[PDB]
Design a protein around this ligand. Sequence first.
Ligand code: FAD
Ligand code: FAD
Ligand code: FAD
Ligand code: G8A
Ligand code: G8A
Ligand code: TP9
Ligand code: TP9
Ligand code: K
Ligand code: K
Ligand code: MG
Ligand code: MG
Lengths: 599, 599, 217
Amino acid sequence: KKKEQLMDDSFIGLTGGEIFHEMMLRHKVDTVFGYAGGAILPVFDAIYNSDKFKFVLPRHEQGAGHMAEGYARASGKPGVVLVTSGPGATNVITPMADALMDGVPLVVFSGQVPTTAIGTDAFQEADIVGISRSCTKWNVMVKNVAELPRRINEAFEIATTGRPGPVLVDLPKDVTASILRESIPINTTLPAVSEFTSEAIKRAANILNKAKKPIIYAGAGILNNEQGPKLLKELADKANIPVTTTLQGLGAFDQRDPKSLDMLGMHGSAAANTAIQNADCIIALGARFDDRVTGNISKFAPEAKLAASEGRGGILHFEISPKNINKVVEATEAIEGDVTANLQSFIPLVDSIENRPEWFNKINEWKKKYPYSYQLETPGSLIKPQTLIKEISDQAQTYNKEVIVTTGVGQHQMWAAQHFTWTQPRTMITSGGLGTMGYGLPAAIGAQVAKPDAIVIDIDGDASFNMTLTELSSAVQAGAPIKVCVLNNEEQGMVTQWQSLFYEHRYSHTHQSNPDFMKLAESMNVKGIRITNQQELKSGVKEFLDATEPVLLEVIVEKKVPVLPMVPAGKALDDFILWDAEVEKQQNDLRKERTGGKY
Amino acid sequence: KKKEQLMDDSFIGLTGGEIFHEMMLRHKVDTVFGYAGGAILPVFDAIYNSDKFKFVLPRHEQGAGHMAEGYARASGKPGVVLVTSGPGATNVITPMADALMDGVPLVVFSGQVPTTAIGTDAFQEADIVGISRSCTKWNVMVKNVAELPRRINEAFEIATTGRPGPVLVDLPKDVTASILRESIPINTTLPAVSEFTSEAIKRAANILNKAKKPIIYAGAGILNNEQGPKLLKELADKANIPVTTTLQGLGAFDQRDPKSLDMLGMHGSAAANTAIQNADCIIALGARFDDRVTGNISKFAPEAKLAASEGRGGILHFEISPKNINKVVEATEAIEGDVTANLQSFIPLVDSIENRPEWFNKINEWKKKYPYSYQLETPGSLIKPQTLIKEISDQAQTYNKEVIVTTGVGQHQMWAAQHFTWTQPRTMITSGGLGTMGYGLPAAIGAQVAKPDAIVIDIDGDASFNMTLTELSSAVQAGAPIKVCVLNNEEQGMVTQWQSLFYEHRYSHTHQSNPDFMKLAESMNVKGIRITNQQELKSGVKEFLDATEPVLLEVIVEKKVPVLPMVPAGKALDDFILWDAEVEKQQNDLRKERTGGKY
Amino acid sequence: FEIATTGRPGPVLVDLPKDVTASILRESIPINTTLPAVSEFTSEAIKRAANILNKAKKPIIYAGAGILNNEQGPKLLKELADKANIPVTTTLQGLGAFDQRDPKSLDMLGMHGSAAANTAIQNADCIIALGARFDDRVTGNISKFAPEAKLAASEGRGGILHFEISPKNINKVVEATEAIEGDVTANLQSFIPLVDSIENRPEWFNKINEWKKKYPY
Ligand SMILES: Cc1cc2nc3c(=O)[nH]c(=O)nc-3n(C[C@H](O)[C@H](O)[C@H](O)COP(=O)(O)OP(=O)(O)OC[C@H]3O[C@@H](n4cnc5c(N)ncnc54)[C@H](O)[C@@H]3O)c2cc1C
Ligand SMILES: Cc1cc2nc3c(=O)[nH]c(=O)nc-3n(C[C@H](O)[C@H](O)[C@H](O)COP(=O)(O)OP(=O)(O)OC[C@H]3O[C@@H](n4cnc5c(N)ncnc54)[C@H](O)[C@@H]3O)c2cc1C
Ligand SMILES: Cc1cc2nc3c(=O)[nH]c(=O)nc-3n(C[C@H](O)[C@H](O)[C@H](O)COP(=O)(O)OP(=O)(O)OC[C@H]3O[C@@H](n4cnc5c(N)ncnc54)[C@H](O)[C@@H]3O)c2cc1C
Ligand SMILES: CCOC(=O)c1ccccc1S(=O)(=O)NC(=O)Nc1nc(I)cc(OC)n1
Ligand SMILES: CCOC(=O)c1ccccc1S(=O)(=O)NC(=O)Nc1nc(I)cc(OC)n1
Ligand SMILES: C/C(NCc1cnc(C)nc1N)=C(/S)CCOP(=O)([O-])OP(=O)([O-])O
Ligand SMILES: C/C(NCc1cnc(C)nc1N)=C(/S)CCOP(=O)([O-])OP(=O)([O-])O
Ligand SMILES: [K+]
Ligand SMILES: [K+]
Ligand SMILES: [Mg+2]
Ligand SMILES: [Mg+2]
């Protein structure tokens, strides 16, 4: 009788595919990104004409994967991928690796050959559990239909807890075709703070209450709770602390606030970099001390390390994954768990501070000294890429709509980060840890599906865009009115920047040929706009943002322009290269000479 | 003094990148397919403006991978890939899995973050040695520059010996930037039959000399020696044996020869399938008894199994990889090693046979009974895809040039296999084991680079072509005048065929939207031709083949047409579905009714 | 415990970090976690297997450790051997599954098994393999193993009937004429009623008895 209460008969008579369909509904999945094939047909048959979720069909499964990532990042829900065996599955490996590195909850369901064929080098058989082991938090192959609901629950749970990340569930065709004939545990059919941590929070507060030069270093983890940005602001306001963010934390703090130091790191603000190198207390909120951020690790945060040794400061690391505590830099206090929940406990213990005259005097001087400067347009010159980004940023904020930005990877990505003004959470959707070129367009489609009333802008490089441009058709078929801006410098700019700097202007295979982007747009049934000169910039960007359909904007921009500031490999975070007009002129002359006028 | 003779100083003072360059030259590499990035820059700097090999730049590293596969398959040389760390490397996983399943010698060099950063979740770091372990024969991470020449030799050796296949060599940036300061073993700077096998060959010959109903089942392994097709023909002629081939063995035997039974298997000739089910001796030459070929394994080759039990026949398996001997079916005699070398020993022991009247009477009757029939065009109907393939096959054989065919994956692939007449080795370049949609275009570019004087035709499906169509730009930039024919049925035809047959015409997500292929071609700077009706077929195909530049031909073809014959899952090889005009009419009516006239 | 004891039984390991076993449970957990029919495909295979055995003139049971994994296993093995009048050999790991004092006992087969058992399996037209995995200590030269049963399978009058719980070990070494997947004892309950009772097999047991006399240890 109690047994009857704990077992469930309600799935008996359903196929594995039908059970999958029901479990999607129970997990409140409203969107699936995927692509059919022989091994996964029993599942596709079950979801045939389903009105329970939207299905989004890409042109390539890598597209499905990055779409699901963009969806997850925009929505805070897991991105669900459904693909076939063999090459359907191996085509999702880059998106899984990408999702792992950026903490994106991706739940990948891959068809598999029947259990009777596994291990025989069967038709369309890949060892996807073996291949994806290193780029997933967890994966599994389902071996019978009775365990399918359990494995689906486990996948969603692992994907969305701790540091979020990708999981894969392998679905043999005979399992999804088979019918459940037995009852299963009813729990499988449904989806306080430690004293140790409480004490660490108290000690952390006592340390911050001594600090004379505090700084908040905030990252993606603060975005994983709806109240995160609110509590970050409450802390910064209460204790009067300047705030810098990573690339992935952009939008966590209102950059219009005077306490904003903007982005730190290799291409972040020299003010932010100076401040963290001089701070006596660093409050690290959901950020992992990535090697793009720390500069030379041995030279990182010297004032905070000194303060820790003298018992008057240090690094206070609020981190959900023990793996990333004390991985790169020693935390003075490690506060384990969800940063937003732990901030609720922390802030009441923190003393309110009215002013910090000497510290904010330095902060304000550094901000004034270190803007994102660059060489402006001159008469007859091409549009500068930095100017283009400012133009899009300024005009997009006109509309009464949320604005979400995705990017490719390269210089355009860095100029997007620098020159947009970031004010809202989950509005920067960019591949940071893995750095996957081609991410921008499919991620924008996923973000647009997640947020159908948002303006979604893909700031893309021409080489990045070439990687995955076939997905323009997918945007049209999905009814996703994304706005793609290709910064066309006819080069892999990020790489040519390094070849200019370190390889004496030897541009080895870094200039790919581009298609005609306007005829390409036309072939894909998307609106095309081309801006070729300075006098077309404002009106072309307006036309781009006013469009109510998918649109591709191509902008011809200045070539061989470096992203600055730059902390070169090996250098301390405050040992940066700054923009200088005269240096840029000399560098142009040198490049011209070295390449016999070719570049 | 002997020590001096065995050590080599000649690489001292070179960077790892320069050593890589030199080892490419020593391995007679004439083409590298690749794409730059930060981790692999020291190697790109070393190969800057090299006149030692052609470098081919794709738009996506998956493209580089399939290009190298097409190159390897066309040339018989290893295909060399050079990519960066992180997503550059993970993007080559599908081509590696593809190459593993089809026995393609692929040598993949991936940049990696410096050894000082490995294992730190570094910028653009993937565990590519872990990820690629299951889809390579072998892989390695080079840990110091002194071992780089050795690891390069090992890679090429493993890739090209035994059953050929993919290998990966991971190249940390600090290793390729570092300079060799010490001498290294000189052997590292440079690139009889067993009595057991001799006895097996003698026993095999005695078995064949008893056979009354022999058949040769020949596959890809016969293509791995230049003399393979010659010795296959010598055996078939001498002992008077009919010859069937796999998909991957097409071209190994001249299909114009009366002894040709054409392709066997799931969609192969019902004559070939009948013959192998009735043969008393099966000579398996470089073929692996794939599950697309055997049909229901327990019901496969019953006459040969009977003959083996009665000591008058059986299966004689000439196979280079012990893993694939007795993996699927028991060999009566296993002859291990290179099939062509072992045929040189075998054929002299085999008795010449003038005629086999009763057997060839059956063979000839079966060939007459079982052509590749289909429903012909009717007035006003669309072009039938089978007719299109015959047209291309007939016209291509006009030219005084070698003709190499690549394909995508799906019905078009099967109709290409059936309806071309295959006569020369290494002219069918198709993804068979993994079955990767998107293969056709990049494989054609690689094949065209391998064979610059050949006509190279990609017979492609519209969904397959959408996967990787960005590589059209690559064909232009590489100067590869490939000929792409898109069979446009506006459907994933292979999958809709299964949904029609097994899922009552429920077409779940199997109709992707297509771009305008003519405007697409124009945007890519490639010539475009569109055939929309029967009266344009001959002249449009002529224009396509006459072109002396890259060209995309789109042909509008009949939709919802099944590939026949077909051996359904679970059925014996001789339990096939054959084309029947009346059945096709009923099936059309049923489809129309079920879908309310939509399909 | 579930994985260790189901399918083919085997070892499992659970690693217990010291801070986990020292830590105290502070939250509720799903109550299910606090507590420890035959397919039509298999039903059809059992029927075909019975029809094959009902044709056999020289059957032999090759029984192994799997028959010991159900308390009723040896009982059903004996019921089958008695009903259809079949001599029984066992592996090393199946010793004790059959009463070796029974005249139908051929003793152990294999590398160091009885030459009577080895002769009988090489001459049998139907081999009923009950919970045994065709180990390389048992089969001898695999290509030369069971030639009369292979011949019979090809002629549609015998073969190898493999009752096996682990799909990995079906068709791993030797091709089964019929594979009967699942617990051998449960499947024997279904099989035996379909099997014809046989009073005598004079010519076969004449050979069996001569071989036993000829080949003592
Ligand atoms: C060309 C290029 C240049 C780049 N240059 C820069 C640069 O100059 N500056 C820069 O900042 N980035 C740069 N990056 C990005 C960089 O590589 C990293 O992706 C980024 O810095 C990581 O930011 P993050 O630590 O906030 O996010 P993540 O990498 O996602 O790390 C988040 C951390 O927070 C933890 N966490 C997650 N959820 C929670 C939670 N609920 N509670 C507590 N903790 C949680 C995670 O476990 C993790 O340790 C660049 C990328 C590219 C492609
Ligand atoms: C949609 C679709 C349908 C298909 N249907 C069919 C079909 O109907 N018929 C068909 O044939 N295929 C079909 N295939 C292809 C099938 O999946 C396999 O790829 C193909 O049958 C393998 O052919 P193979 O054994 O000759 O080549 P491989 O898979 O390359 O196997 C070659 C064998 O020869 C060995 N070998 C290699 N080199 C040597 C050497 N030097 N000496 C000796 N041995 C060597 C290898 O080790 C290996 O065991 C289909 C594919 C797709 C995508
Ligand atoms: C020196 C030496 C010499 C040896 N020589 C011999 C010899 O001459 N003869 C000999 O027999 N052995 C010999 N062996 C032993 C041999 O190596 C194997 O261990 C033995 O033959 C395996 O017997 P088995 O197949 O019955 O048991 P196992 O290896 O346990 O195989 C049992 C099979 O039954 C299956 N099974 C398990 N439970 C069930 C169930 N409930 N229902 C259905 N199937 C089930 C299993 O999955 C498995 O496939 C020797 C060992 C040594 C050390
Ligand atoms: C592709 C998925 O392959 C398998 O899962 C499979 C693999 C090995 C053995 C048996 C099978 S299967 O029989 O279960 N299914 C099957 O072959 N399906 C199928 N679907 C289509 I669409 C096409 C096609 O052949 C061109 N085959
Ligand atoms: C991308 C390759 O990254 C590394 O190999 C690396 C990884 C971790 C730590 C240190 C290094 S590295 O210092 O050796 N090289 C480096 O950072 N190169 C680089 N190249 C470009 I082009 C851009 C860029 O940043 C945008 N960084
Ligand atoms: C090749 C490369 N990086 C290496 C690389 C290679 N391959 C992949 C899939 N991803 C990356 N990051 C870059 S950043 C060039 C980007 O060029 P772009 O997209 O035209 O952008 P931009 O010119 O603004 O630097
Ligand atoms: C989806 C699919 N197969 C599953 C699949 C999914 N994804 C990949 C990367 N490869 C494969 N093989 C096929 S065959 C449809 C092919 O459609 P097509 O290229 O238009 O060819 P055709 O219509 O001639 O069958
Ligand atoms: K900014
Ligand atoms: K043909
Ligand atoms: Mg660019
Ligand atoms: Mg199609």
